Design a protein around this nucleic acid. Structure first.
Ligand code: ZN
Lengths: 207, 466, 222, 257, 241, 302
RNA sequence: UUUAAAA
């Protein structure tokens, strides 16, 4: 870590949602994935790695322990306080999907690298539905048990994650947006959850 | 606010006030202790000597005010004098006159404002209290700390009106406290609205006479009425870089090196080729924060502002002596009689040469100057950051304001400083300490200071000379 | 001509001080001692290499200095005869003798020699001996010169730090321990300095053996 | 908290039934008695100390600073510090990022109520200190900053130059402070303001924000415990969400008093 | 504020007190019966300090545990809003704070009978809500009154007093404005004795003046002990009856 | 990972002190003989008092002054202890109580007490100033860590010379070391640290409420005497009869009369160590400037 | 912005 001299200043300059799905290509962890989304004037490109399950020495817990961590990549560096906020929301969702009772006295470590988040014109609301679909593909590649696929969608700040073909909600997130926009925001993400749900299965069955 | 009781007559209250500085607001809360053991410091008093408490050296406080004060005509007679903030700053020289004031009571709220506006005037005021003897007696009654004179602030009341009410309450208490001894209290204030507010307070009548009224009530009035003073800044910004180029192009402006006169640091003479005589630059605003030796851009003045070569002696040491270093956007009587005396010479003079004003600085002659601290601005017993004055050796230069915590140590030390900046709001340039050369009038310290003021290289030869 | 003193510290198993030109490095070796949990090795000896600069804290510049010094001492010590043990080797650079920001070859050359000397005084099993020298080439004559001064580095094109391993009375070279180079050079100049560096290190161990004998021999049967 | 699996099944069966029997017997719309102290830090503009029934105590201090709003983005910065927890802890930065959204300058609180000149404006520093905690304190801090902001006094403006303020008079901070509530779902029943034992065996949790007599934007649905984490029917999302719309005015009437 | 008189010839300081007078002392015991076993809200002048004593209890990990005595931990946390200007630094991991935390542990581990409580740990949590000079001495008096509330056996009281020297005049209980204009000495006197468990001098003081400063310092510290003692008498009497 | 002291060794040293005996042979008030070894460059000082060996390195650079004191320079110091002085020091533990208390004592002695002329280290107010750094390297530990380190830093600052700087209004040109001779730093007073170790042949109970002071105080303890120490005291004086700083926290609660006695005993020590540093610096200057008598420019007349 | 001479 060099960081250079402290006397230097940073530079100051005065419908359809394309999706890409991949998995594997990582040898350190057990299962990984890569989701990319390019729509309107915003692009998303993040990598998710699942290092687990790892047996914990001296532990005697009845079920597993999930550890999700969002790390700033190289563009659009968010604040560290908000990165762990979404992580705690991600753990609150996956603690109900991943079969925790199957892996006693062991934990699962999640590593999501928001490498390239770009805007072309809260900004983190649009990236949450893309992080959930990247961990489910990585958790399934690692041989870990998950109760049904987990996806989410965006509807002007409101991010809702569904499960079981949208029958039951697993998580809810909303920032900015407006007022009284609830049922319409739910159905905008309900049809978007199914758009991401069947697309994950189509990528996980190819060869 | 509220007020809590303590032991043996002590009481603590809270003093809150917002401080505005550089556009910021900071809520400042302080502790204020109200006590009941503060004496009137009068020899006539027989009640206060029973409640006095000695100091840290176990010394009982001495009572200064004479038991037989100056007796005037009815209904004043034997009286004491209470001063105001304006009266101290105005007639400070009249206070020090041996045939004028004798028994004076300076309240605390007045001493705080006098010190906050002119530390050297505060110093000579405190000196009168210390040098109290048979022909002069000055005391300081801490009215803001006494439980009998501390006045609580009123809603939407002027800060100046509350302190004026504190001075009235102080004279009310002193009048009541001295009734057994038959001594009146005369409040010398030029504030007409303050005296009119006192005559409405029939609860405790006081005597309110202005300065010109109190002087006329003294026996030696004719000997001191001629000595009373008369009852009662930003530098222009430098021109832009584009205007000074167009001014020097079309002959509107001129360029030259300032040569401050040998016996006046406020009269500059820039030599120009288009004039037979050097163009004078008299005044603080005309020099415009320039130092002796700078290459400046001057702008000529109309013939109505042309002046003659001044015939007075003025150095940075003998000018504006009652000022503080941190003055930014108090008049001495000696400077009034001198500045008004030179104006009569230029009116009848025939050597009236053209004058100009500095509007831009092209090259600074700043360096490391040698001088010494001005004692009038130094607190010789505080190890804190204090703004002090520096009297430079070159009498053609002004005083420099520096920040230091070694002011008590650096006193009587011939030091070296370097000027940092001089904005339009500051009256004096800003500098800082760099090097101490030793004690004043020391052969080792003076000869070293002599060579630095002339760029004389006195260091040993290089090793490459061997 | 270089100076060296052995056994200068009282609270370590082995100490040393290597002085060359202007660079001075004091090393301290302590072992075998009880290692920590993350340090113990099941079969062989563990090494805790720590180098520190003369000015400022230990930044990442000295981290690569530890990793290169670690590769020189690891094959030199018979680690397998100290199972589940630790050896602390601390190198303190008193004077750099060069430019810390632009160069770091003379300090590596002195830390290698100072560490080997402190490993001898501490009584650790060593398979052989060691010698390290700095080498640079002036851009003027483009010839190879050993132990270049501080002024000779700023004009150098490429720098070198050759560390060798000597056996059989300090004559036979068993293996080349370290040859770290950075700059501008070719294959013709590589063996042009490698052959010259082998005879300059041969007289170094011959000078080291004389030093480590003038001090260990009086402490023994004498 | 830490309980035994024997009593966890007892509280789970008692809170998921149709009567929805609570441990302490309170109704799902009732709360626990709370003590709130205000105005005790002279060096600060506003101050408040809140004490809960279970022992949770939190102190909030409010400072002010004049800053150019044309170059200062956020004018309401919240600094949260929990005793016994690191400043970089995962549980500390989440509330720090969550409270900055419920009190965002412009969204949760309008910046027009703290502007001075057309160039300068007041920046509100909300310092939070949690002395003790036994559950999620995001709902307790909201009650503390509410009474602190409504008891805050800032210096009065005197009136392009640098602004000047009066020496004695100080204006009151007229700001509508948003409120945060915590709801726990147990199977098919909603619980407003859970306890340490209720939130330990619950299935999921809900965080609702209330501002200007309405449910405002920053809301969450974070899990209250990693053991029993279950997905909820969307009819439960709107049930507890509309449940606070009926009893929150009763909270403000008792809190703004 | 401004350029004030520190000690006028009338013997009055900038806040009205005299050379041997103390700021108002209002201590409080058992202020957090729900957060710690020991509690003390110290209000010495403008200073407002919250001191908690959690223990003696089992350590959270069996790694650090003395089988012959107890472990005394002190956590001094200076809040950002302690002064007028809100602190921008971190303060928690500050090197000046670690010196104070250690100086407090050494001061009390010799006075607290750690032997009576073996294989245990005593955590002391301190939060400074406001400071105004003499903060070290007020930290002392807070820990003393907080351990007593926790029922921890101590040999005697530990009193914290701050003394300043202005020219040739000592000043008891220095506030912030007085510490920024003279040297400061904080003492740690044990009970009514002259035994010093703490002696911090952080500014230059002439040797010919230090002895007299110490005498006037320990004299005022005894006065601080009585104010704490009288607080415990009033608290114990109203609690029993 | 810590020093094991046998019960037999602990009892022997305590009883030896009760008979006015120290293992090294000094007295109860005898400071160890100090030795100063100046290195090559300026600011390279090696201090050897007894078996304790310490080395200090002085540097400086251009930095921004503090916003509350724009007319003063910075003084940085960090004393990180390596396993070189003993395997009991875990490397990388910069938050150690010994390292923390050492830096804070020297920082108060040099910076806060006004030993280094910070006002002379100001080049331009509130923008450019000197940040003098003092790196202390603990070489061999045998007690007296802060005593030797304070001697090393004070001998180092008086031996170090900062680069010359010429101010041309707002620009600042740092003159190379070969261009102009560096200027030495300004030193007002010389703070010298003297530590005191305390022992009690009784117990803690007989010491809290006991008028009879049976404490044993020794000046500058060794490592073995330090490990058996009960109470610790550190004073710092100068030749101007001024108490620079005092740090006494914990251990045996001592009375005011004995602490005042420690200062008067320490003044005779710091007075001798002061004149030694002034003499050893004078001898080292003549070593570098051998022909300095011919190169003098300011010469007297007749 | 003090001539010349020896210093
Ligand atoms: Zn009276």
């Amino acid at each position: 870590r060099l960081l250079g001299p402290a006397a230097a200043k940073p530079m100051a300059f005065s419908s359809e949602q394309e999706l890409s799905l991949h998995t594997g290509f990582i040898e350190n962890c057990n299962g990984s994935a890569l989701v990319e989304a390019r729509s309107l004037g915003h692009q998303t490109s993040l990598i998710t790695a699942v290092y687990g399950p790892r047996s914990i020495r001296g532990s005697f817990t009845s079920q597993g322990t999930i550890s999700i961590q969002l790390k700033n990549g190289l563009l659009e560096k968010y604040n560290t306080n908000e990165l762990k906020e979404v992580s705690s929301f991600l753990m609150g969702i996956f603690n109900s999907v991943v079969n925790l009772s199957r892996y006693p006295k062991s934990g699962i470590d999640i590593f999501v690298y928001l490498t390239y988040d770009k805007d072309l014109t809260s900004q983190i609301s649009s990236l949450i539905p893309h992080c959930i679909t990247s961990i489910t593909l990585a958790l399934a590649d690692a041989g870990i048990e998950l109760v049904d696929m987990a996806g989410a969608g965006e509807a002007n700040g409101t991010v809702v994650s569904f499960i079981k073909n949208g029958e039951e909600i697993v998580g809810f997130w909303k920032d900015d947006g407006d007022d009284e926009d609830l049922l319409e925001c739910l159905d905008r993400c309900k049809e978007q959850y199914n758009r991401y749900r069947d697309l994950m299965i189509s990528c996980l069955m190819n060869q | 606010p509220r007020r809590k009781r303590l032991a043996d007559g002590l009481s603590v209250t809270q003093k809150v006030f917002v401080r505005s500085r550089n556009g910021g607001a900071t809520k400042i809360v302080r502790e204020h202790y109200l006590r009941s053991d503060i004496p009137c410091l009068s020899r006539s008093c027989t009640k206060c000597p029973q409640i006095v408490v000695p100091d840290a050296q176990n010394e009982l406080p001495k009572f200064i005010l004479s038991d037989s004060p100056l007796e005037l005509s009815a209904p004043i007679g034997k009286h004491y004098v209470v001063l105001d903030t304006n009266v101290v700053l105005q007639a400070i020289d009249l206070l020090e006159n041996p045939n004028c004031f004798f028994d004076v009571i300076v309240p605390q709220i007045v001493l705080d404002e006098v010190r906050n506006k002119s530390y050297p005037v505060y110093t000579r005021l405190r000196t009168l209290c210390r040098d109290s003897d048979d022909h002069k007696r000055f005391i300081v009654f801490h009215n803001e700390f006494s439980e009998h004179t501390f006045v609580e602030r009123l809603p939407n009341e002027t800060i100046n009106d509350r302190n004026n009410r504190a001075i009235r309450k102080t004279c009310q208490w002193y009048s009541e406290h001295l009734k057994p001894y038959d001594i009146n209290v005369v409040l010398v204030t030029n504030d007409r609205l303050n005296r009119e507010a006192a005559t409405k307070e029939v609860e405790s009548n006081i005597i309110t006479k202005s300065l010109v009224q109190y002087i006329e009530l003294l026996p030696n009035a004719d000997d001191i009425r001629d000595s009373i003073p008369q009852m009662d800044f930003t530098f222009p910004e430098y021109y832009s870089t584009a205007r000074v180029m167009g001014g020097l192009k079309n002959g509107v402006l001129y360029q030259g090196n300032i040569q401050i006169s040998e016996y006046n640091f406020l009269e500059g003479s820039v030599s120009l080729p288009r004039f037979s005589k050097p163009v004078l630059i008299v005044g603080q605003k005309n020099l415009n924060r320039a130092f002796n030796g700078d290459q400046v851009i001057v702008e000529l003045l109309p013939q109505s502002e042309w002046k003659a070569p001044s015939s007075i002696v003025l150095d940075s040491e003998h000018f504006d002596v009652n000022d503080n270093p941190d003055i930014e956007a108090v008049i001495s009587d000696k400077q009034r009689r001198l500045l008004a005396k030179d104006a009569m010479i230029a009116q009848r003079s025939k050597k009236i040469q053209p004058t100009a004003k500095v509007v831009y600085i092209q090259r600074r002659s700043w360096r490391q100057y040698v001088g010494q601290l001005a004692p009038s601005s130094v607190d010789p017993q505080s190890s804190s950051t204090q703004n002090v004055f520096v009297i430079l050796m070159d009498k053609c230069l002004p005083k420099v304001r520096i920040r230091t915590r070694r002011a008590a140590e650096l006193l009587d030390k011939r030091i070296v400083i370097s000027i940092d900046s001089w904005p339009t709001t500051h009256k004096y340039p800003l500098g800082h300490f760099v090097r101490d050369l030793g004690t004043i009038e020391s052969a080792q310290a003076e000869t070293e200071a002599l060579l630095l003021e002339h760029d004389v290289e006195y260091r040993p030869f290089s090793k490459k000379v061997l | 001509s270089v100076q060296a003193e052995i056994g200068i510290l009282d609270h370590v198993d082995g100490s040393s001080e290597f002085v060359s030109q202007d660079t001075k490095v004091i090393c301290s070796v302590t072992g075998p001692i009880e290692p920590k949990a993350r340090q113990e090795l099941p079969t062989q000896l563990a090494l805790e290499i720590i180098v520190r600069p003369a000015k400022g804290v230990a930044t990442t510049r000295e981290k690569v200095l530890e990793d290169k010094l670690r590769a020189v001492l690891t094959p030199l010590i018979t680690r397998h005869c100290y199972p589940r043990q630790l050896c602390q080797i601390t190198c303190q650079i008193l004077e750099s003798g060069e430019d810390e920001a632009e160069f770091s070859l003379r300090e590596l050359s002195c830390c290698i020699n100072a560490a080997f000397l402190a490993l001898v005084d501490a009584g650790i099993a060593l398979n052989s001996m060691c010698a390290s020298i700095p080498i640079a080439i002036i851009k003027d004559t483009s010839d190879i010169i050993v132990d270049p001064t501080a002024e000779q580095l700023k004009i150098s094109l490429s720098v070198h730090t050759l560390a060798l391993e000597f056996v059989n009375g300090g004559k036979v070279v068993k293996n080349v321990l370290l040859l770290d180079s950075n700059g501008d050079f070719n294959e013709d100049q590589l063996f042009s300095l490698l052959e010259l560096g082998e005879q300059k290190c041969q007289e170094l161990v011959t000078n080291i053996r004389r030093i480590i004998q003038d001090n260990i021999s009086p402490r023994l049967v004498v | 908290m830490s309980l035994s699996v024997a009593e966890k099944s007892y509280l789970y069966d008692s809170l998921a039934s149709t009567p929805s029997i609570r441990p302490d017997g309170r109704l799902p719309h009732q709360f626990r008695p709370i003590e709130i102290f205000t105005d005790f830090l002279p060096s600060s503009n506003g101050s408040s100390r809140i004490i809960a029934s279970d022992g949770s105590e939190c102190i909030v201090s409010i400072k002010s600073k004049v800053v150019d709003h044309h170059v200062e983005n956020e004018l309401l910065q919240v600094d949260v510090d929990i005793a016994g927890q690191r400043d970089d802890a995962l549980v500390v930065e989440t509330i720090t990022s969550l409270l900055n959204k419920v009190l965002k300058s412009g969204s949760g609180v309008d910046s027009s109520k703290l502007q001075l000149t057309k160039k300068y404006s007041f920046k509100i520093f909300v310092d939070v200190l949690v002395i003790s905690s036994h559950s999620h304190p995001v709902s307790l801090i909201s009650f503390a900053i509410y009474s602190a902001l409504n008891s805050t006094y800032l210096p009065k403006l005197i009136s392009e130059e640098l602004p000047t303020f009066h020496d004695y008079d100080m204006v009151k901070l007229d700001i509508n402070p948003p409120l945060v509530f915590i709801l726990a779902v147990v199977g098919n029943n909603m619980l407003l303001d859970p306890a340490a034992n209720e939130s330990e065996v619950a299935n999921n949790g809900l965080i609702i924000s209330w501002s200007n007599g309405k449910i405002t934007s920053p809301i969450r649905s974070v899990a209250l415990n990693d053991s029993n984490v279950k997905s909820f029917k969307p009819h439960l999302l709107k049930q507890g969400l509309a449940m606070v719309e009926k009893y929150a005015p009763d909270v403000v009437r008792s809190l703004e008093n | 504020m401004s350029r004030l008189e520190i000690y006028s010839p009338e013997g009055l300081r900038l806040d009205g007190r005299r050379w041997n007078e103390l700021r108002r002392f209002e201590s409080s015991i058992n202020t957090h019966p729900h957060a710690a076993d020991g509690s003390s809200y110290m209000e010495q002048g403008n200073n407002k300090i919250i001191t908690l004593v959690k223990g003696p209890k089992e350590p959270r990990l069996k790694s650090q545990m003395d089988t012959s005595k107890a472990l005394l931990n002190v956590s001094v946390n200076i809040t950002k809003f302690s002064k007028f200007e809100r602190s921008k630094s971190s303060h928690k991991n500050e090197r000046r704070v670690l010196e104070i935390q250690t100086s407090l542990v050494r001061m009390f581990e010799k006075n607290v009978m750690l032997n009576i409580y073996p294989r245990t740990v005593i955590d002391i949590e301190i939060h400074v809500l406001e400071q105004d000079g003499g903060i070290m001495g007020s930290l002392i008096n807070g820990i003393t009154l907080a351990l007593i509330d926790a029922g921890i056996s101590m040999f005697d009281y530990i009193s914290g007093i701050s003394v300043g020297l202005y020219d040739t005049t000592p000043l008891l209980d220095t506030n912030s404005l007085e510490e920024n204009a003279m040297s400061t000495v904080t003492l740690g006197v044990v009970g009514k004795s002259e035994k010093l468990s703490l002696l911090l001098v952080e500014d230059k003081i002439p040797l010919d003046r230090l002895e007299n400063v110490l005498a006037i310092g320990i004299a005022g510290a005894h006065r601080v002990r009585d104010l704490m003692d009288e607080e415990l008498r009033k608290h114990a009497q109203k609690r029993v009856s | 990972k810590d020093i094991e002291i046998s019960a037999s060794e602990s009892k022997f040293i305590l009883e030896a002190l009760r008979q006015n005996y120290r293992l090294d042979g000094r007295s109860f008030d005898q400071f160890r003989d100090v030795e100063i070894t100046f290195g090559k460059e300026f600011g390279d000082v090696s201090v050897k008092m007894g078996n304790t060996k310490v080395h200090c390195r002085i540097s400086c650079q251009i930095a921004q002054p503090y916003e509350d004191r724009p007319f003063e320079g910075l003084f940085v110091i960090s004393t990180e202890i390596s396993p070189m002085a003993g395997s009991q020091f875990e490397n990388g533990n910069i938050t150690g109580e010994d390292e923390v208390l050492c830096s804070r004592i020297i920082e108060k002695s040099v910076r806060r007490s006004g030993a280094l002329d910070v006002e002379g280290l100001c080049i331009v107010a509130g923008s450019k100033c000197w940040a003098v750094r003092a790196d202390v390297h603990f070489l061999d530990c045998d007690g007296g860590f802060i005593d030797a380190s304070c001697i090393a830093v004070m001998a180092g600052l008086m031996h170090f010379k900062k680069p010359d700087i010429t101010v041309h209004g707002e620009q600042i040109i740092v003159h190379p070391v070969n261009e102009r001779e560096p200027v030495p730093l300004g030193i007002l007073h010389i703070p010298i640290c003297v530590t005191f170790s305390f022992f009690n042949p009784q117990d803690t109970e007989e010491n809290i409420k006991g008028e009879t002071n049976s404490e044993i105080s020794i000046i500058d303890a060794t490592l073995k005497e330090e490990l058996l120490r009960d109470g610790v005291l550190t004073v710092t004086l100068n030749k101007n009869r001024e108490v620079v700083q005092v740090s006494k926290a914990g251990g045996l609660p001592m009375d005011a009369l004995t602490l005042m006695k420690c200062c008067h005993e320490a003044y005779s020590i710091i007075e001798k160590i002061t004149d030694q540093i002034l003499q050893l610096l004078k001898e080292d200057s003549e070593k570098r400037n051998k022909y300095a008598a011919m190169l003098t420019s300011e010469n007297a007349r007749e």
